């Protein structure tokens, strides 16, 4: 199963064979560190120099590339994407789980599809349906009615608390928690009361989710991930935030309550984003983005002072909170000179 | 649970009901979204126009807007107080456990009080005590000698270390962490040498903590949370903090050690807070904050420049930059301008 | 047993016996709360007057002190130093297992050193390997093919993924999370593509991670953690990071993916830093530093605008956001003068 041939892999990735299609590639490896057997790409501008010395079995390449080639050579029009396709191909990721463990702990109640995979010690409380081909990883929760769509999977010690919806071939990695109370409470004066959050979380299909993320659940209304979008580790989504269509979120992203969130966005790492607010579609926001105003025209959007080097910086600090005077210095001559010739 | 009339609600609730009082009410919904048997609630105010078309069969509303009423009104001074009682009255959220799950490992040496719960794979080590109608979730870890006070609640995975005290009517949300080491080094010749941490973490009545916080342990004194406390998601409270009755701090806050933060605070989320510090009560660190200096009065602080369209941010980062530039200048041409003539 | 004798106490630790030699020795504590039992050290130059007012057995010390010493004390070089050793060779601090539980989950393919310690629920995969004196937590789930070295400690419910190598005498916090899959995808016609993510974490010796951290791992090649280094709690680390020896990360770091930091560097808390970059040897980057672009020069590196009360705020922010405004009428009335003569 690990193997197959050059030319059974060019089929299936529609690239012209150049090669010996009877080459046998084991797996995918970078430029470098290739060895015989393993297929590599180049998107590279100019690392065709160097394939000489690479110890790959073939390379996937453009046909511009073709000329310079030293080995078998797969000719695509998107060397990238090819890549991807190869590695899904010839991947070596492991299930979360196979079969069901005979530790697991079950609720009678739970309904399973056809060729689910429950691993070690997970536990599924009551009411909770799993489609077919799901696999939920060891040590994992799964509160009371949660649903999850066929085909999604689960690693090792995910937390899904009760009334969850999970859409159809989501991947979810370790750590992660999904519908936590929200961050919600009345008051008197001084001393906080907790309003019970009975809102979901609704999520779509094809869903990445990486680790130590947390998904608050709504108020009464549902918090909801849009169907393809992709969330990197350990970003904050308060309780019914909307998320559109294929909107990535990078890393660390911390969004407030009620935030709506087009299609085909680009959220930056450690971005903070103020709530109850809306940005539209197609915006792309910066790495370390300070966002407290909507968004109401696409288009890519920045904010914060870069490092600088400590002395350069100690000045510039300084500087900036003295703005103030610095600005009135300057209406002074602005007047000495407008009125005075 | 079951249903309940509306005029036993409107008692518990002290309000004035304001039509039929016979109508059954299942739950609590919004007003967008509320159907026969829901109450929903308004002091949304320009909402009194779409009151009509509202499905709700009972609405939460001030006096000023009871001439509105297209249905069973109730009539309060404060609405969304009176929500966050009803809610609690009709509340669907599900228990963490109900009883002692089979799968739970408890140690012989651990004292339970009356009416635990303790979920599947919880592991309650040597020492341990939980209080008259504490409930601890599934796959949690509770630590030697660690005691948890009546009426305390932790979901599913959250991981509470050794020597760690927890009050009364607290609710610690899955994936946290209470108890860890924190940064504790002298150095051997480029390298770090560890110090064993030795204080332990304290946790007073009506805590509130979200999903993925870190709490970590004092090095010989303690870490302490005042009572009803309120901390939000991924927050990363370090050693020896201690944190006053009241406060409330949003996500993805970083507080470094020694840190004292006093009553009624709020602390915006993602604020950075130095460490060996003192910030007095009743003060409001708004979002994004960096709190390099030591806060000495109440009032509100904040920190950052908002967002700007990316064309417009390169500019005013490269004139923020060497606005040293700028200083000289402006010093350059107020110099031959006054002393010259 | 658990205690030993101030005599010989002094002797292990390298210091000068003044005063009693036979007072039982439980263990280490504070100034401010130290009792009969416990031996405290005083760092300060000036708590010295409180010293009669401590009720401690011992107390370790400067020969600049001795005289104003209120009972027993030990003289060294530095006190701070033979404290760290103190507490180093005294504390009850529970090791996070103690042999294998009956509910631990292991692979009959899983290989054991002696003396390996498993916690309750564990579930230890097919392939894996653990060294001599290696401790697993409760709840731990450990993946395929991974290694641990020997003298290395797991605390609670830690997620260690497949084909991870972790070295020897390293310790992992509880919540963390190694070797999940990087921020991978190919965007083609808008819909993200999953790239598998094929590489490993390879960790050194030595290492100390913090709770709830995140290491990815690489798309191909692999993500590098050096000998020796620290990264305390909420990190991230993205795929294909590499970390020289003996760098330290302050809390709540993030590094985007393909960064690399040399050795010797100290990032302080929740900075962010670009991916495809180098960070050479002998980097500080001060707190909430936000790093952009390369550094090629060794040294102390900061950014941010402190906090200012929100009044003075609103100024500097709104002056700041129309830095060109004022560039421009700076230049247009430097003009005006070096033209009127």
């Known amino acids: 199963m690990a193997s197959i041939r050059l030319a059974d892999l060019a089929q299936q990735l529609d690239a012209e064979l150049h090669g010996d299609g009877d080459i046998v590639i084991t797996g995918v490896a970078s430029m470098q560190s290739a060895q015989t057997g393993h297929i590599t790409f180049m998107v590279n501008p100019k690392y065709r120099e160097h394939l000489g010395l690479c110890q790959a079995s073939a390379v996937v390449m453009t046909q511009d590339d073709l000329p310079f080639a030293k080995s078998a050579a797969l000719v695509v029009k998107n060397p990238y994407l090819t890549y991807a396709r190869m590695a899904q191909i010839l991947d070596t990721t492991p299930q979360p789980a196979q079969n069901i463990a005979p530790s697991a702990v079950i609720d009678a109640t739970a309904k399973l599809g056809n060729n689910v995979s429950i691993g070690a010690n997970a536990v599924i409380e009551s009411g909770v349906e799993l489609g077919d081909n799901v696999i939920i990883g060891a040590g994992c929760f799964v509160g009371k009615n949660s649903k999850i769509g066929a085909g999604s999977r689960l690693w090792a010690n995910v937390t899904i608390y009760h009334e969850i919806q999970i859409g159809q071939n989501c991947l ?123 968004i109401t025209e696409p288009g890519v959007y920045s904010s914060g002072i870069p490092l600088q080097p400590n002395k350069v910086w100690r000045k ?26």
Chains 1, 2, 3 share one sequence.
């Open 172 to 294: 979810i990695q370790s750590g992660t928690v999904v519908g936590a109370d929200g961050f919600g409470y009345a008051n008197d004066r001084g001393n906080w009361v907790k309003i019970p959050q009975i809102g979901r979380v609704i999520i779509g299909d094809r869903v990445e989710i990486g680790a130590c993320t947390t998904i608050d659940r709504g108020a009464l209304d549902d918090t909801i991930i849009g169907n393809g979008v992709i969330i990197d580790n350990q970003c904050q989504i308060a309780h019914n935030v909307v998320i559109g269509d294929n909107t990535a979120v990078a890393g660390g992203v911390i969004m407030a309550g009620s935030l709506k969130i087009g299609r085909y966005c680009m959220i930056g790492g450690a971005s903070v984003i103020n709530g109850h607010m809306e940005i539209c579609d197609k915006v792309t926001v910066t790495g370390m983005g300070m966002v407290m105003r909507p």
């Open 316 to 341: 510039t600090a300084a500087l900036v909170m003295n703005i103030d005077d610095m600005s009135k210095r300057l209406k002074s001559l602005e007047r000495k000179v407008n009125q005075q010739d």
